[PDB]
């Protein structure tokens, strides 16, 4: 009869056990309450299914050849222009987009495989907009341009800036408008270790590590300013970043 296949994006598709006279397979899926259907060249659950919403919007589900990726699209009732698009990639991260009438993206939500998110809203035709990064325990806020995402934390005269380039590279900088050399913070970025080292009055004070697990840790230097002491502490709330900038 039919075989159930598990899909990225918490979906399932039913594929005929045998092919038809044309050699093709029937596909059936129920997405939320919507029944979708299609025919495919392959026998493993991959291909294209289509349906409509109760409001006549066109729906298409596209399952990549190797079942690695799924794309769920909603269109205008004529199928012409996109309304929304959700793509679940093979690492199980996702991008969910909304589009204006011209088919230009106006919102993009990236959910990384670890559940952290980049939320881009109010996206304009030049690729600029508002940006939020949702971490475990706290959120960072900033803007988006076509060159980079810049997320800002402010504390005293200190501004911490977390940059995420268009290609995805992270870099961090710190600017302090304090001009008293006793208290002013300055900082240097080490791209190899994703580590921002903060200095006050010519002595290192703290290492802020922006990890590959999308967390931030802080570790103090000894009063000699030369070697680290104790062990790094994972930041769990926005106040602890602000504390590190004091």
Swiss-Prot record:
Belongs to the OspA lipoprotein family. InterPro entries: OM_lipoprot_Borrelia, OM_lipoprot_dom_sf. It comes from the Bacteria. GO terms for cellular component: cell outer membrane; cell surface; membrane. Changing residue 87 to A: In strain: PBre. Gene3D superfamilies: 3.90.930.1, C1 set domains (antibody constant domain-like). The gene is ospA. This is Outer surface protein A. Keywords: Cell outer membrane, Lipoprotein, Membrane, Palmitate, Plasmid, Signal. Changing residue 117 to K: In strain: 21343WI. It is a lipid-anchor. Induces host (human and mouse) cytokine release by monocyte cell lines via TLR2 and CD14; nonlipidated protein does not stimulate host cells. Its main location: membrane. It is found in: Cell outer membrane; Cell surface.
């Amino acid at each position: 009869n039919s075989v159930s296949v598990d899909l990225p994006g918490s979906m399932k598709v039913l594929v005929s056990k045998s092919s038809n006279a044309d050699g093709k397979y029937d596909l059936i899926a129920t997405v939320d309450a919507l029944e979708l259907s299609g025919t495919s060249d392959k026998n493993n659950g991959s291909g294209v299914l289509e349906g409509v919403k109760a409001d006549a919007s066109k729906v298409k589900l596209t399952i990549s050849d190797d079942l690695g990726q799924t794309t769920l699209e909603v269109f205008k009732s004529d199928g012409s222009t996109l309304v929304s698009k959700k793509v679940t990639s093979k690492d199980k991260s996702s991008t969910e987009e909304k589009f204006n009438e011209k088919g230009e993206v106006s919102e993009k939500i990236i959910t990384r495989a670890d559940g952290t998110r980049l939320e881009y809203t109010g996206i304009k035709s030049d690729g600029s907009g508002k940006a939020k990064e949702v971490l475990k325990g706290y959120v960072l806020e900033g803007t988006l341009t076509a060159e980079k995402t810049t997320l800002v934390v402010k504390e005293g005269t200190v501004t911490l800036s977390k940059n995420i380039s268009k290609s995805g590279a992270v870099s961090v900088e710190l600017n302090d408008t304090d001009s008293s050399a006793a208290t002013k913070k300055t900082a240097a970025w080490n791209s190899g270790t994703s580590t921002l080292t903060i200095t006050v009055n010519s002595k290192k004070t703290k290492d802020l590590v922006f990890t590959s697990s999308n967390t931030i840790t802080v570790q103090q230097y000894d009063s000699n300013g030369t070697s680290l002491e104790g062990s790094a502490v994972e930041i769990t709330k926005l106040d602890e970043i602000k504390n590190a900038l004091k």
